[PDB]
Design a protein around this ligand. Structure first.
Ligand SMILES: [Mn+2]
Length: 176
């Protein structure tokens, strides 16, 4: 996996190997974030494995990743969902297209990205890739939003920032 570097505008200028791109001085690159719900409306919350270089062992929204060069945002979502969760999903829907952020993890690892957010429904059972996901929980969106509002530090920075955006939160609720 590589990450796409972006300049002032979201114009791709080059690529870097994924692992090598995330350091204490991570440069701006493209990513995606996705919230998955099942047919019952429950939200899938996952805990990043201890082997993840950035934010290992952290509870976060369903799946996040980096689109590859030439790959559309939607297909990147499909690819990482199958890879980390072994699940098939409905067509990804945009919920927060202009989300951008920069955050530093406990180890000093930084994430600096233009990160559009999507939502989708799972159409198959989960088949966990323990190399990427160490735990997960199917919950009610309402309880997660309450958790995020009360103790945001207990979750990943991007999950918190995405869920606290008034418009994003409204669109997410439309999935329950
Ligand atoms: Mn990244």
């Amino acid at each position: 996996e590589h990450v796409i570097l972006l300049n002032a505008q979201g114009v791709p200028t080059g690529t870097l190997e994924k692992y090598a791109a995330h350091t204490a001085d991570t440069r701006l690159h493209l990513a995606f974030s996705s919230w998955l719900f099942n047919a019952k409306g429950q939200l899938l919350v996952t805990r990043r494995a201890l082997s993840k270089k950035a934010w290992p062992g952290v509870w976060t929204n369903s799946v996040a990743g980096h689109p590859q060069l030439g790959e559309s945002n939607e297909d990147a979502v499909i690819r990482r969902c199958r890879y980390e969760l072994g699940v098939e999903i409905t067509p990804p829907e945009s919920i927060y297209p202009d989300f951008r952020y920069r955050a530093t993890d406990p180890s000093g690892i930084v994430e600096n990205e233009v990160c559009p957010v999507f939502a989708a429904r799972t159409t198959s059972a989960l088949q966990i890739n323990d190399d990427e996901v160490m735990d997960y929980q199917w919950c009610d969106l309402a309880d997660v939003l309450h958790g995020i509002d009360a103790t945001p530090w207990a979750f990943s920075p991007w999950m918190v920032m995405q869920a606290t955006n008034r418009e994003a939160r409204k669109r997410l609720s439309a999935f329950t």
